[PDB]
Ligand binder design. Structure first.
Ligand SMILES: [Fe+2]
Ligand SMILES: [Fe+2]
Ligand SMILES: [Zn+2]
Length: 304
């Protein structure tokens, strides 16, 4: 077979605060992600934030770890694959420290700090992949899923500047063959929250300049693929648990960017399956019912 790095990217999967603490959408996604890993393979899973709804977790004794995470993603195959996690606004309404500390309890759960670098090598090749995991809440401010806010400006401006500066240096320095950036809030989205102004100003210009293949996010509760004039991909995967059919911000996204949107009210939701070979990164969007919805290809570039 083609030597490839394979991963699932799933966003906004954090169940509900009413027992049984999961939705049939979350369960369907867990079941389909398990089928995907088992038959197509995966090296890891990325969570794109909003891991526990509506106010994250309190501490490492929080039952939501068991009920919303362990009980749902319980297939032996999702347990043998590492998860790399970042936070959304609803995580920040609780204790993000607790989710970080959970890394010391669960072998598969990796959340070493709010933002961090990941480095992978495609097996049997020299082809490497960096993924920079961001905390867009501390970068941009709070943005409640169920209001139409722009994250105005961060609680701690110094921490926002530190993260942005760390990211600029990481991207400038990165020697990997593919570089991906991941965070909760969208740069571009046609949906309920739409483009995050903070990220359009602060993050977007880094992406093309440093040869970033794609930015991955969730926050808008749907599946989207967008691509800009520099060929940068926007993988939006926020349909692990809820669905939102809004196209409210369709006009706030530059003409020609949107390639694919799925927000159907009667969908079980879905996720993205990413495969990276020496030739291209492909992104396959998979509905929780098991249907392939969209596939797109991003050719390998000569990076700076
Ligand atoms: Fe969300
Ligand atoms: Fe969110
Ligand atoms: Zn249980």
């Amino acid at each position: 077979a083609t030597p490839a790095l394979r991963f699932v990217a799933v966003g906004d999967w954090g169940g509900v605060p009413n027992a049984p603490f999961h939705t049939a959408r979350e369960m369907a996604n867990a079941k389909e992600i398990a089928r995907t890993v088992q038959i197509l393979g995966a090296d890891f899973i990325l969570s794109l934030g909003d891991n526990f709804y509506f106010t994250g977790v309190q501490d490492i004794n929080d039952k939501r770890f068991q009920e919303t995470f362990e009980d749902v993603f319980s297939d032996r195959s999702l347990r043998k694959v590492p998860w790399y996690v970042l936070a959304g606004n609803h995580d920040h309404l609780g204790n993000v420290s607790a989710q970080i500390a959970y890394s010391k309890i669960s072998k598969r759960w990796n959340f070493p700090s709010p933002f961090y670098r990941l480095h992978f090598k495609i097996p049997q090749t020299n082809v490497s992949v960096a993924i920079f995991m961001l905390d867009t809440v501390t970068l941009c401010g709070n943005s409640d899923d169920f209001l139409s806010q722009q994250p105005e400006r961060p609680r701690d401006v110094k921490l926002a500047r530190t993260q942005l500066s760390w990211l600029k240096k990481q991207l400038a320095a990165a020697r990997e063959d593919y570089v991906l950036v991941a965070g909760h809030y969208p740069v571009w989205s046609i949906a309920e929250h739409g483009p995050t102004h903070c990220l359009v100003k602060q993050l977007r210009p880094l992406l093309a300049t440093y040869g970033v293949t794609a930015y991955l996010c969730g926050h808008d509760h749907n599946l989207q693929y967008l691509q800009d004039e520099n060929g940068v991909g926007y993988v939006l995967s926020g349909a692990g648990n809820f669905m939102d059919p809004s196209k409210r911000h369709q006009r706030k996204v530059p003409n020609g960017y949107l390639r694919f949107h799925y927000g159907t009210e009667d969908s079980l939701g879905g996720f993205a399956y990413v495969e990276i070979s020496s030739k291209e990164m492909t992104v396959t969007y998979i509905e929780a019912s098991g249907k392939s919805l969209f596939k797109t290809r991003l050719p390998r570039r000569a990076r700076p």
